[PDB]
Amino acid sequence: CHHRICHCSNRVFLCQESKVTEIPSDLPRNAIELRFVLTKLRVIQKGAFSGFGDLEKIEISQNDVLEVIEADVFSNLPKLHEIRIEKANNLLYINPEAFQNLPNLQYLLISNTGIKHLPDVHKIHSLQKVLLDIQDNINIHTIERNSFVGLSFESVILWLNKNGIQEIHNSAFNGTQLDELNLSDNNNLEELPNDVFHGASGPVILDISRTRIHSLPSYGLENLKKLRARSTYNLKKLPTLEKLVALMEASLTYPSHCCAFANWRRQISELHPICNKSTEFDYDLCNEVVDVTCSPKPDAFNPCEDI
Amino acid sequence: VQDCPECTLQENPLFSQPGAPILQCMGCCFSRAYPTPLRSKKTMLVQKNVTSESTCCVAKSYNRVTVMGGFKVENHTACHCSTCYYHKS
Amino acid sequence: NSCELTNITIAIEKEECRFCISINTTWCAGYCYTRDLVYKDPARPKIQKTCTFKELVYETVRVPGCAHHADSLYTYPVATQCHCGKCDSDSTDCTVRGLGPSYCSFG
Numbered sequence A: 001c002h003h004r005i006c007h008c009s010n011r012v013f014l015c016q017e018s019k020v021t022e023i024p025s026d027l028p029r030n031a032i033e034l035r036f037v038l039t040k041l042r043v044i045q046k047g048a049f050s051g052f053g054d055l056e057k058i059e060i061s062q063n064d065v066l067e068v069i070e071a072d073v074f075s076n077l078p079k080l081h082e083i084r085i086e087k088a089n090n091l092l093y094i095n096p097e098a099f100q101n102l103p104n105l106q107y108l109l110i111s112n113t114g115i116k117h118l119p120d121v122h123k124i125h126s127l128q129k130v131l132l133d134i135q136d137n138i139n140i141h142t143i144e145r146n147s148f149v150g151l152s153f154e155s156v157i158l159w160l161n162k163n164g165i166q167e168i169h170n171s172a173f174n175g176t177q178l179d180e181l182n183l184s185d186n187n188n189l190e191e192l193p194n195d196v197f198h199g200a201s202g203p204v205i206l207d208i209s210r211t212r213i214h215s216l217p218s219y220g221l222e223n224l225k226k227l228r229a230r231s232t233y234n235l236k237k238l239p240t241l242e243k244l245v246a247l248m249e250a251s252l253t254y255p256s257h258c259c260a261f262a263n264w265r266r267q268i269s270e271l272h273p274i275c276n277k278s279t280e281f282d283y284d285l286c287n288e289v290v291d292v293t294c295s296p297k298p299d300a301f302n303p304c305e306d307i
Numbered sequence B: 001v002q003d004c005p006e007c008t009l010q011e012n013p014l015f016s017q018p019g020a021p022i023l024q025c026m027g028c029c030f031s032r033a034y035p036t037p038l039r040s041k042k043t044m045l046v047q048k049n050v051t052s053e054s055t056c057c058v059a060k061s062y063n064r065v066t067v068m069g070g071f072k073v074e075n076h077t078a079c080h081c082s083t084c085y086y087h088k089s
Numbered sequence C: 001n002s003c004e005l006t007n008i009t010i011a012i013e014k015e016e017c018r019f020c021i022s023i024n025t026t027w028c029a030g031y032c033y034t035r036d037l038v039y040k041d042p043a044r045p046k047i048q049k050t051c052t053f054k055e056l057v058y059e060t061v062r063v064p065g066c067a068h069h070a071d072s073l074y075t076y077p078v079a080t081q082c083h084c085g086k087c088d089s090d091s092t093d094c095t096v097r098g099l100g101p102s103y104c105s106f107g
């Protein structure tokens, strides 16, 4: 195999270095994978990738001069499960029309970029479960209302950690099946509004580690199985076990919290069905278990629940 | 020299029944870490001096089945070393 | 499994002098073991390990200058211990491929 600019192997095309100033129009429409690496590429033009029905993966990474992604850039790619946008330091603008219908999207990664706002995902409408991984983008300060609806008919994993997020509006997760939400390492994030989890199913896993979040929402956590709040210092109270009905695991900051959990039982509704059969673990859905697993456990001497 | 078996289809101990096994990609893939070259650092708004290239053993295709009493599981039909989604901090 | 300390060669790029110098040092490379879960429960765990540094130290090195530019110092990380574990994103760029350790813009 071969091509003018881009190196090629097995319908996988890699356009590298500085001689690539724009996306070659002569790229085979039977391409499985496209990678743009170390290009002096100021813009990615409208409908640039439209019309590769064979295209599974798109990598755009380490482009210092890239400032914009035009409208309808990712559209008509029924076979695209993976988009990866990494290390574009001058990219501040992603056109709200860039992300079009992509029924097969599994993984959208935007990491280490200039972008000032979350990407617009309401036209993606994926049939697959989607991992949205948006990280190390310091200029992203706020999450609007309905920021994730229409990303997928299937449940969703949202990693928004290590950003500059200071602001989360009510109903930011509305119209969304949330498996998992990681907001950790947004250091300036002070408050979750009481309606964050309105019209959202889940989360089942929530990570607010290393944020200044003061308080957890009173509703929306009826499905929470796993809570990770490490070095979350001004989160002092917490909902009562009766409000976190599903919680099985918590890794927290203040040991007194863990003692609150160890001291309040829960668990009857007998339970069912069929785990029948015939230093850590592996697969087991029997509901075998134990008071919430909690840490830090107030191990080193000391009581719990105060005096 | 540590004998790490290549990523390949195998038999899930749970979920599997005689005559009706379910196949699951598992094995080993190549990964490495080295200092981030300067040319890359130019492109990062958040400096990372160490760069890590990895790949993970995942199903390149699969068929959805229901077994055991209602468990939706995938029955992996093929395997390759591809993008790691879940290896991070 | 097989993840081990291995000698490599890296490229220190001196941008003002239009050349790079090569240095031997020690980093991680090898094979780690992953599974791809068959039952996709949101409360998994889905965890994947990769071969990366368990411990590292920084070393400093003199980088020649050319006519009309002073020589300088460059400080780079060196691996002490390697293991199969999570890629730590505070310190590390966690990707599929980088430009490679010995990449140089001038050759």
Ligand SMILES: *[C@@H]1O[C@H](CO)[C@@H](O)[C@H](O)[C@H]1NC(C)=O
Pocket (backbone or CB within 6 Å): A145, A146, A149, A171, A174, A175, A199
């Ligand atoms: C909740 O989601 C539904 C469907 O997407 C939407 O129509 C409704 O307006 C949302 N609620 C709010 C307050 O935006």
Ligand SMILES: *[C@@H]1O[C@H](CO)[C@@H](O)[C@H](O)[C@H]1NC(C)=O
Pocket (backbone or CB within 6 Å): B019, B020, B021, B022, B023, B065, B067, B075
């Ligand atoms: C999974 O597919 C394999 C081979 O295609 C087949 O032998 C097996 O019956 C399938 N398992 C189930 C539970 O359908």
Ligand SMILES: *[C@@H]1O[C@H](CO)[C@@H](O)[C@H](O)[C@H]1NC(C)=O
Pocket (backbone or CB within 6 Å): B047, B048, B049, C075
């Ligand atoms: C990253 O390398 C740069 C030198 O280019 C240095 O300033 C920084 O301290 C290095 N390591 C860490 C942990 O910051």
Ligand SMILES: *[C@@H]1O[C@H](CO)[C@@H](O)[C@H](O)[C@H]1NC(C)=O
Pocket (backbone or CB within 6 Å): C006, C007, C024
């Ligand atoms: C390679 O590892 C060996 C271990 O004995 C070490 O002595 C050597 O310095 C390393 N690399 C080079 C270039 O010698």
